[PDB]
Structure formats: C-alpha cells, structure tokens
Design an enzyme around this catalytic site. Sequence first.
Site, mmCIF file in Angstrom:
data_model
loop_
_atom_site.group_PDB
_atom_site.id
_atom_site.type_symbol
_atom_site.label_atom_id
_atom_site.label_comp_id
_atom_site.label_asym_id
_atom_site.label_seq_id
_atom_site.Cartn_x
_atom_site.Cartn_y
_atom_site.Cartn_z
ATOM 1 N N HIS A 40 -12.590 -4.666 -0.176
ATOM 2 C CA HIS A 40 -11.627 -5.050 -1.192
ATOM 3 C C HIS A 40 -10.491 -5.899 -0.609
ATOM 4 O O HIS A 40 -9.701 -6.462 -1.383
ATOM 5 C CB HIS A 40 -11.146 -3.840 -2.015
ATOM 6 C CG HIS A 40 -10.037 -3.059 -1.395
ATOM 7 N ND1 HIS A 40 -10.211 -1.861 -0.735
ATOM 8 C CD2 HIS A 40 -8.703 -3.281 -1.445
ATOM 9 C CE1 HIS A 40 -9.017 -1.404 -0.388
ATOM 10 N NE2 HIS A 40 -8.094 -2.243 -0.810
ATOM 11 N N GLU A 52 0.023 -6.777 17.477
ATOM 12 C CA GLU A 52 1.238 -6.731 16.689
ATOM 13 C C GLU A 52 1.920 -5.367 16.740
ATOM 14 O O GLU A 52 1.272 -4.321 16.656
ATOM 15 C CB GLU A 52 0.936 -7.013 15.207
ATOM 16 C CG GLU A 52 0.614 -8.472 14.905
ATOM 17 C CD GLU A 52 1.836 -9.363 14.846
ATOM 18 O OE1 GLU A 52 2.893 -8.935 15.376
ATOM 19 O OE2 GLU A 52 1.736 -10.474 14.271
ATOM 20 N N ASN A 54 6.052 -5.416 15.371
ATOM 21 C CA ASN A 54 6.806 -5.991 14.263
ATOM 22 C C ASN A 54 6.077 -7.249 13.775
ATOM 23 O O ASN A 54 5.966 -8.238 14.514
ATOM 24 C CB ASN A 54 8.225 -6.328 14.708
ATOM 25 C CG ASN A 54 9.107 -6.661 13.523
ATOM 26 O OD1 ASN A 54 8.710 -7.398 12.625
ATOM 27 N ND2 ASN A 54 10.311 -6.090 13.503
ATOM 28 N N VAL A 57 8.314 -10.608 13.776
ATOM 29 C CA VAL A 57 8.969 -11.070 15.000
ATOM 30 C C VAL A 57 7.893 -11.311 16.047
ATOM 31 O O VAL A 57 7.051 -10.432 16.256
ATOM 32 C CB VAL A 57 9.989 -10.040 15.525
ATOM 33 C CG1 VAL A 57 10.661 -10.537 16.803
ATOM 34 C CG2 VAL A 57 11.025 -9.710 14.463
ATOM 35 N N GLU A 62 1.159 -10.710 21.000
ATOM 36 C CA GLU A 62 0.278 -11.112 19.917
ATOM 37 C C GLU A 62 -0.833 -12.048 20.387
ATOM 38 O O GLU A 62 -0.660 -12.864 21.299
ATOM 39 C CB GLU A 62 1.064 -11.866 18.839
ATOM 40 C CG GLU A 62 2.166 -11.050 18.157
ATOM 41 C CD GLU A 62 3.530 -11.104 18.803
ATOM 42 O OE1 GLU A 62 3.681 -11.611 19.945
ATOM 43 O OE2 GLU A 62 4.471 -10.613 18.130
ATOM 44 N N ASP A 84 -17.164 0.146 0.596
ATOM 45 C CA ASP A 84 -15.947 -0.648 0.778
ATOM 46 C C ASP A 84 -15.735 -0.960 2.267
ATOM 47 O O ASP A 84 -14.888 -0.368 2.954
ATOM 48 C CB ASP A 84 -14.735 0.061 0.172
ATOM 49 C CG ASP A 84 -13.496 -0.829 0.109
ATOM 50 O OD1 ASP A 84 -13.629 -2.054 0.303
ATOM 51 O OD2 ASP A 84 -12.403 -0.265 -0.183
ATOM 52 N N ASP A 171 0.400 10.178 3.215
ATOM 53 C CA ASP A 171 -0.797 9.443 2.806
ATOM 54 C C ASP A 171 -0.698 8.003 3.294
ATOM 55 O O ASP A 171 0.372 7.533 3.689
ATOM 56 C CB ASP A 171 -0.867 9.462 1.258
ATOM 57 C CG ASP A 171 -2.191 9.074 0.607
ATOM 58 O OD1 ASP A 171 -3.216 8.878 1.294
ATOM 59 O OD2 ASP A 171 -2.163 8.984 -0.656
ATOM 60 N N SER A 172 -1.815 7.296 3.242
ATOM 61 C CA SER A 172 -1.756 5.845 3.309
ATOM 62 C C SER A 172 -1.367 5.279 1.929
ATOM 63 O O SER A 172 -1.346 6.009 0.933
ATOM 64 C CB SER A 172 -3.075 5.312 3.880
ATOM 65 O OG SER A 172 -4.171 5.736 3.092
ATOM 66 N N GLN A 174 -0.303 1.236 -0.430
ATOM 67 C CA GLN A 174 -0.574 -0.187 -0.620
ATOM 68 C C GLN A 174 -0.144 -0.989 0.617
ATOM 69 O O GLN A 174 0.978 -0.841 1.108
ATOM 70 C CB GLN A 174 0.172 -0.664 -1.874
ATOM 71 C CG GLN A 174 -0.629 -0.547 -3.189
ATOM 72 C CD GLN A 174 -0.741 0.865 -3.755
ATOM 73 O OE1 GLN A 174 0.185 1.664 -3.673
ATOM 74 N NE2 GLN A 174 -1.882 1.160 -4.365
ATOM 75 N N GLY A 175 -1.043 -1.854 1.111
ATOM 76 C CA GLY A 175 -0.840 -2.624 2.317
ATOM 77 C C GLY A 175 -1.460 -2.009 3.568
ATOM 78 O O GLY A 175 -1.548 -2.684 4.600
ATOM 79 N N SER A 177 -4.610 -0.772 3.283
ATOM 80 C CA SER A 177 -6.026 -0.963 3.020
ATOM 81 C C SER A 177 -6.685 -1.740 4.150
ATOM 82 O O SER A 177 -6.143 -2.709 4.672
ATOM 83 C CB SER A 177 -6.233 -1.747 1.734
ATOM 84 O OG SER A 177 -5.920 -0.968 0.616
ATOM 85 N N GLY A 178 -7.904 -1.305 4.478
ATOM 86 C CA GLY A 178 -8.687 -1.939 5.519
ATOM 87 C C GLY A 178 -8.429 -1.399 6.909
ATOM 88 O O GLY A 178 -9.217 -1.681 7.823
#
Length: 223
Positions: A40, A52, A54, A57, A62, A84, A171-172, A174-175, A177-178
Amino acid sequence: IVGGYTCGANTVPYQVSLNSGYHFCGGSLINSQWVVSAAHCYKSGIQVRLGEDNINVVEGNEQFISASKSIVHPSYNSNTLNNDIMLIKLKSAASLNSRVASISLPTSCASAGTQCLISGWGNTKSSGTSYPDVLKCLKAPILSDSSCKSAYPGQITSNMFCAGYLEGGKDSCQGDSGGPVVCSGKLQGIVSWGSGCAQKNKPGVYTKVCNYVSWIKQTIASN
Ligand SMILES: N=C(N)N1CCCCC1
Ligand SMILES: [Ca+2]
C-alpha cells in the site's frame, strides 16, 4: 509510533525512509540492493533514504539511492490488504556498515508472545497529529491469532498478525506503514493497517513476512 520512545540515531540500521519529496513510508533493508515495504506504499518516484535519524537534517550517515524497480506482490488486494508486501530494488548497492545494515529474513514464523521492535517516523498522537523528526521505537508482543480475529471480525487472513496492546496507548500509526517488525533479529512483520492508532481493542495489524520468504528469494534471484 504512539507511546514509543526515541530509538537513538542509527540504532535500527535496517530502517529506511521512502521519500518522494518527503517521507511517506518506512521499509527494511534486506540486502545491499533490496528493500521490503508494504504494497500500500507503492508509488513511482521513490528515493530510498538509508542511515537516517532526523529526516529533516543531513547528519552525516545518510545514503540516498533511487529505486530502479518496484514489485508489488502478485496477489496484493488493496481492499482487504491481503498480501500487503512490496520489494524495491535500489539503482546501486548500499554501502553496508554498522549504521546501515540489512535485516535477516525469518527461518521460521514467530509465535504469539514473542517480543518485537517496531519503528518509524509516523504520527505520535492517537488524537490529532504530531510527526517526529527522529526515529521512534516501540517494543510490543505478537498477539494470538484468536485475539487478533476477535478484535477485527471478518478481516484477518493467514498473511496477517496482530501485535501491540489491547489496552490501548501503544501502536504504530500513519507514516509508519511499510516499516519493520523485528523479533529475535529477524524481520517478521511489515506495518500494514489498523483502526485509528493505539485505540483500545484495536491492535496493529502486520504483514506476516515468514509466508513470503520463498517469493522474496526467488524474486531477488531473477531481478
Ligand atoms: N497500527 C496501526 N494502527 N496502523 C498501521 C499504520 C497506519 C495506521 C494504522
Ligand atoms: Ca537525516
């Protein structure tokens, strides 16, 4: 992540941020050139951001590498969220080190009661919205299939498991996901869906990675 803690920079070295001008999903590095995420989370124009902490920044560890191809599971159903899972190939291999490292795929499926680490840059509030700059973490157990099905009648397939806390608060969200669910050093879950975030009797639902190891390996071997 709601009700979690600040992981610490680069302490989750397989966690990646998927970026299309901004962070939009997590993922997990499974070798130098492949990432696992949720179907999804599919879109075009993905840059994988490794190393990563932050996400706003440049802190010096990275690696930013464009995707060369995406492969959504053959049987993904976007209405039910069955299957999924999605693989993303990097245009070049990541340079592996202590801070950027792959996570092992599971040899065996994990059992209810196993404690896992869930991580991401998603919302930290169950009511309203606050998105963190640094990576958040949550320790949470896998829940029994019976309690998962009781929480979500008519919705839990053999390719899903619940993890978290029926009392709410952790919980986990929104954002996230994956992103990864790692248990005993193996990638057992992918952040998939839920009901709100951190609500009582509505634990997080995760893609059951052990069911997909054969598909992952044979896809990598021919792509
Ligand atoms: N674990 C929960 N509650 N989720 C999964 C990530 C998106 C929001 C729903
Ligand atoms: Ca950064």
